Amino acid sequence: RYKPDWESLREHTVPKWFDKAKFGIFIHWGIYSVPGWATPTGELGKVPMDAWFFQNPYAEWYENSLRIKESPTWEYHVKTYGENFEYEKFADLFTAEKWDPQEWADLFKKAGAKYVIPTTKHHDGFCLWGTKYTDFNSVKRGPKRDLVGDLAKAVREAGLRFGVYYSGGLDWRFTTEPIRYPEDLSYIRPNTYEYADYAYKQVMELVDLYLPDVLWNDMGWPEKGKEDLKYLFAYYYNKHPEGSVNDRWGVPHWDFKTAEYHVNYPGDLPGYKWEFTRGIGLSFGYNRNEGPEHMLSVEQLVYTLVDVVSKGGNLLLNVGPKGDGTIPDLQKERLLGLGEWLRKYGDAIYGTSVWERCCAKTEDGTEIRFTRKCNRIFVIFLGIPTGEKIVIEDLNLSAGTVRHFLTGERLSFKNVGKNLEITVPKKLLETDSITLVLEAV
């Protein structure tokens, strides 16, 4: 099997299904979904961190914001719900009246996602499964139902892989002071041995009850429980070798790394498996304030996915559900948009590998991304060029045959100097959707 030690765990690497998958759905759903409110300030990495917690665009961070008197959230809360209204009271209002996990799994499958990962416990400590280590869970409060297990059955029934998100680094049920500055994160944590046991038992429980395909931890792991992971990871891998874990544990082992909005985004091939995550908007949890102005457009999403895939990554796109379990129309439509694109071009995404390079551009300034499948080379343009004459800068090919992807039509090309020229018959160009895609063999 695997032995509880880093040298040994190192023998386990990102499983094939995950590398081949390329696209997954993240779900931040919780009692924060009820107030479903945040100031849509901007993207993490571009909003200054001395103001970020005070005008937090992450709506799942509502309680932390609510603990900061006079901050937009405090303002909003008191005026909408009042002061005699504690954050926890939202667990009772959290009723998932319209929820149907099969509908969700159908939606994510249609969107082309090959795996799904919900928040089983977010920073506020509310648990979406009937854990036996707390009564602040979806079985005893609000939904009166094992959201995690029920969704796992649906997803798996649809043929998708199922993972779990857990906030091991933060649990506000163990702290009183909110996070006001990034520096606060170094001391405002549970900090106790009790919390380390708790996190450990809760993840062991998720493993025993649902044997997830991915262990997606967040905000690091309690310093006192770090050595525990040697055991937990061995326990997990020995019951499920195709399982996997991310890089937010702060220990030697991890199967694939992560990046959030701008934070840790690679500009070129990074050299290890990784995964990109972001919201359809600026929040993970639902934000009734966000208008389309804040969300990506189907095209941006397709471009986001290609840039990610060309660099060896998986896109973990987040969906932010309403307290009643429905998925906001704006998010549903973009998901489908993406699903439509993937239905046409999926063969140049799923099962692919990185090429010698990820990137290129045309004389005219259109960005190009590359992907490979044995001897095939997908050339994906982030847009559809206007003219039939395309000039790719700094690129030569020895392939000899270059087809227009969707139609299969052999095309004319030649390496003119340090560039590459191809003529893409407008009949064909007009045929593509959001991306001109060519296959070089």
Ligand X SMILES: C[C@@H]1N[C@H](CNC(=O)CCc2c[nH]c3ccccc23)[C@@H](O)[C@H](O)[C@@H]1O
Q: What tokens were used for 109?
A: 């499958």
Q: Is 194 in the site for a second copy (CB under 8 A)?
A: yes
Question: Are 31 and 124 in contact, with CB atoms under 8 Å apart?
Answer: yes
Q: Closest CB to ligand X among 108 and 405?
A: 108
Residue linked to tokens 């996990």 = 101
Q: Is 132 in the site for a second copy (CB under 8 A)?
A: no
Q: Closest CB to a second copy among 109 and 253?
A: 253
Query: Quick one: what does residue 254 bind among ligand X, a second copy, none, with the CB cut-off 5 to 8 Å set by partner type?
Result: a second copy
Q: Is 11 in the site for a second copy (CB under 8 A)?
A: yes
Question: How many other CB atoms are found less than 10 A from the CB of residue 326?
Answer: 17
Among 18, 23, 61, 254, interactor with a second copy by CB under 8 A: 254
CA 227, chain centre distance (Å):
27
Question: How many other CB atoms are found less than 10 A from the CB of residue 252?
Answer: 14
CB of 251 to ligand X, least distance (A): 15
Among 192, 300, 386, 401, interactor with a second copy by CB under 8 A: 192
8-state DSSP, 353? B
Residue linked to tokens 């399982």 = 243
Q: Closest CB to a second copy among 192 and 300?
A: 192
Q: Is 219 in the site for ligand X (CB under 6 A)?
A: yes
Q: How many Å is the Cα radius of gyration of the chain?
A: 23
Q: Is 78 exposed, middle or buried (0-12, 13-18, 19+ CB in 10 A)?
A: middle
Question: Are 362 and 368 in contact, with CB atoms under 8 Å apart?
Answer: yes
Q: Is 208 in the site for a second copy (CB under 8 A)?
A: yes
Residue linked to tokens 């170094």 = 186
Q: Is 228 in the site for ligand X (CB under 6 A)?
A: no
Q: Closest CB to ligand X among 15 and 118?
A: 118
Q: Coil, strand or helix: which one is 155?
A: helix
CB of 219 to ligand X, least distance (A): 5
Q: Closest CB to ligand X among 185 and 406?
A: 185
Taking CB under 6 A as the binding criterion, the range among 57-65, 143-151, 153-161, 378-386 that sits at the site for ligand X is 57-65
**What phi and psi values does residue 362 have, to the nearest 5 degrees?**
-95, 165
Q: Coil, strand or helix: which one is 25?
A: strand
8-state DSSP, 170? -
d(CA 294, CA 283): 10
Among 29, 32, 37, 58, interactor with ligand X by CB under 6 A: 58
Give me the 265-304 binding string for ligand X, x by CB under 6 A, dash otherwise: ------------x------x--------------------
Among 18, 32, 87, 200, interactor with a second copy by CB under 8 A: 200
Q: Which letter, b or e, does each residue of 120-151 get, where b requires 16 or more Cβ atoms within 10 Å of its Cβ?
A: bbbbbbbbbbbbeeeebbbbebbbebbbbbbb
Among 51, 263, 399, 416, interactor with ligand X by CB under 6 A: 263
d(CA 252, CA 100): 39
Query: Quick one: what does residue 389 bind among ligand X, a second copy, none, with the CB cut-off 5 to 8 Å set by partner type?
Result: none
Question: Are 433 and 440 in contact, with CB atoms under 8 Å apart?
Answer: no
Binding-site ranges for a second copy (CB under 8 A) = 1, 3-4, 6-7, 10-13, 176-177, 181, 183-184, 186-189, 191-194, 196-197, 200-201, 204, 208, 224, 228, 230-231, 234-235, 239, 241, 247, 250-254, 257, 270-272, 374-375
Binding-site ranges for ligand X (CB under 6 A) = 28, 44, 58, 60-61, 182, 218-219, 260, 263, 277, 284
